């Protein structure tokens, strides 16, 4: 006989585990996008939104870049993103990464003609 509380834990609790925690998404993508050729890139963010929506950010709210230099813009809305963080140290070659999918407003630096994104400055919060 399963208690009401017990059923809740079976059906809804999975503390400490998540689709991100066991995902090899960052391992595969950091390698696929050539960020593991010379050295294991320390940190990186992937944006899961249509390209035109990210490009449109260049014409949204103008904010100061993190280091104060350049022209940065913040997205009108939160976007789907994934943070990739090299884990356990070194070992370049083996580039091991912690995958963290989330939703955050992003800030990118834009430049050129057309005025497009050239640098991912940061995710907000």
Q: Is 80 a catalytic residue?
A: no
**31 is known to lie in a ligand binding site:** no
**99 is known to lie in a ligand binding site:** no
In 10 A of CB 39, how many CB atoms?
12
**41 is known to lie in a ligand binding site:** yes
57: left (phi over 0), alpha (psi -120 to 50) or beta: alpha
CA distance 107 to 72: 6
CA distances from 93 to 27, 37, 90, 103 (A): 12, 8, 8, 30
Q: Which residues neighbour 38 within 8 Å (Cβ) at sequence distance 6 or greater?
A: none
Contact letters for a copy of itself, residues 40-59 (x by CB under 8 A): ----xxxxxxxx--x-----
Q: Is 119 a catalytic residue?
A: yes
**62 is known to lie in a ligand binding site:** no
The answer to the question of residue 113 lying near a copy of itself (CB under 8 A) is: no
- Fill in the DSSP letter of residue 75: -
The answer to the question of residue 34 lying near a copy of itself (CB under 8 A) is: yes
- Nearer to a copy of itself (CB atom), residue 34 or residue 67: 34
Residues recognised as catalytic: 12, 119
* Binding-site residue set for substrate: 7, 10, 41-45, 66, 85
Q: Please give the residue ranges that form the binding site for a copy of itself (CB under 8 A).
A: 4-5, 7-20, 22-23, 25-26, 29, 33-35, 44-51, 54, 80, 82, 99, 101-103, 108, 111-112, 116-120
């Amino acid at each position: 006989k399963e208690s009401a509380a017990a059923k809740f834990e079976r059906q809804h609790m999975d503390s400490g585990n998540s689709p991100s925690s066991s995902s090899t998404y960052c391992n595969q993508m950091m390698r696929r996008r050539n960020m593991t050729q010379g050295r294991c890139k320390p940190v990186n963010t992937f944006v899961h939104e249509p390209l035109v929506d990210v490009q449109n950010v260049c014409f949204q709210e103008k904010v100061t870049c993190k280091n104060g230099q350049g022209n940065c813009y913040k997205s009108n809305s939160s976007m789907h993103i994934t943070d990739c963080r090299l884990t356990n140290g070194s070992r370049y070659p083996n580039c091991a990464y912690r995958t963290s999918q989330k939703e955050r407003h992003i800030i990118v630096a834009c430049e050129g003609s057309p005025y497009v994104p050239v640098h991912f400055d940061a995710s907000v919060e």
